Amino acid sequence: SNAMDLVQKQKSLQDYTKSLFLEGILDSQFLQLQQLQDESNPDFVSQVVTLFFQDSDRILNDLSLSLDQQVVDFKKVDPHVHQLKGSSSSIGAQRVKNACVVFRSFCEQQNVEACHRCLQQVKQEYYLVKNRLETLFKLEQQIVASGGMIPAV
Amino acid sequence: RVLVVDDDPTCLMILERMLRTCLYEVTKCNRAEMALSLLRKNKHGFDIVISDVHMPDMDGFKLLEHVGLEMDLPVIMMSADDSKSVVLKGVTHGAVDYLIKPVRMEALKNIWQHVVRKRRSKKPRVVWSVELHQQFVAAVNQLGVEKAVPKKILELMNVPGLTRENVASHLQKYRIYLRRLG
């Protein structure tokens, strides 16, 4: 019940968010998303991030099928990678954005072996940012579940 | 005020929010043939279209032709591709400006310029064919965008039946985009 426990949770959430920027996982575009969230749009960051997850979960499933084809069709591989670059670049998942840029380098060369390694790195960077952002939102809901509040300027 | 055409749902949901904080009414769309029929309806009153180059049911550059040139409307190109080749393809297909994903909030304030330049004009349209526009941008970039003035832009195109106030108001419409090139 401790008031002191809610105080620790506020610091841990604060320090955690700081660590996402300093470690290069999120760039300043994510801070722009948080700045579009106000009292009238109170779940905006969560809603955008959840949509980015649904669309990108689809794109990675589609790329895994596309690259597994017996004759790879880059007309179907390339526009997925392109959407995921803008997708991730718009929420600030910087390592995902950069990994897609290298992926686009290899569809443009139609290098399937490289495309398989690129898809593995993009998956790994997406699952990383998905773990971090989900941790971020869980920490906030824990604060509310303690009866607390995030001031949200 | 603004129709936005983007098959990326996350970029669409963000850009709607950003445009709304700049106090635009915003309508979403994700098919180019859907945006075309939406624009086709009478009294629809859309002030600016922002459209992605990547569109699943149409060449998104041909969509710029339909909205920029066949209709007398300001269409602003949008893409997560940064290259000079893609930016030039915006002007040469009728777009009036461009926005690069991730869309800068500052870049959105500069688009209000294009509707007010539009509102200086129910009265007859002047439609440019895509090829006539493409030699208009050929003439100004061969002339130098600073140097290109309605008399020599028409004198380089050498199109019989093209007047100077066709070129004068076309320079008015695309001045901003062509200055940003080079």
Author numbering:
A (entry chain C): -2 to 150
B (entry chain D): 38 to 158, 236 to 296
Question: Anything the authors wrote about it?
Answer:
The MSP signaling involves four consecutive phosphorylation events at: (i) the kinase domain of the sensory histidine kinase, (ii) the receiver domain of the latter protein, (iii) the histidine-containing phosphotransfer protein, and (iv) the response regulator. The second element in the MSP system, AHP, receives a signal (phosphate) from the receiver (REC) domain of HK and translocates into the nucleus to phosphorylate the REC domain of the RR. ARR1, a type-B ARR, contains the GARP domain for DNA binding, in addition to the canonical receiver domain that mediates AHP1 interaction. To bring new insights at the molecular level, we investigated the structural and biophysical characteristics of the AHP1/ARR1 complex.
The asymmetric unit (ASU) includes two complexes, each consisting of one AHP1 molecule and one ARR1-RG. While the electron density map clearly defines the entire AHP1 proteins, the region spanning 77 residues (from 159 to 235) in ARR1-RG is not visible, indicating the flexibility of the fragment that links the REC domain and the GARP motif. ARR1-RG contains the REC domain (residues 38-158) and the GARP motif (residues 236-296). Notably, the α3 helix is slightly bent compared with that in the published GARP structure of ARR10 (Hosoda et al., 2002). Despite being separated by 77 residues (159-235) in the ARR1 sequence, the REC domain and GARP motif interact with one another through a vast interface of 1044 Å2 [calculated by PDBePISA], as shown in Figure 2B . The Tyr291 residue from the GARP motif reaches deep into a hydrophobic pocket of the REC domain (inset). In other words, because part of the GARP interface that binds DNA is also involved in the GARP-REC interdomain interaction, GARP must be set free for it to bind DNA. AHP1 is composed of six helices with various lengths (from 3 to 10 turns), in which helices α3-α6 form a four-helix bundle. The phosphorylatable His79 (Ruszkowski et al., 2013) in helix α4 is exposed towards the ARR1 recognition site, which is highly conserved among type-B ARRs. In the case of ARR1, it is composed of the catalytic Asp89 at the C-terminus of the β3 strand, the double Asp motif (43-44) in the loop between β1 and α1, Ser116 at the C-terminus of β4, and Lys138 in the loop between β5 and α5. ARR1-RG binds AHP1 with a 1:1 stoichiometry through a relatively small interface of 875 Å2.
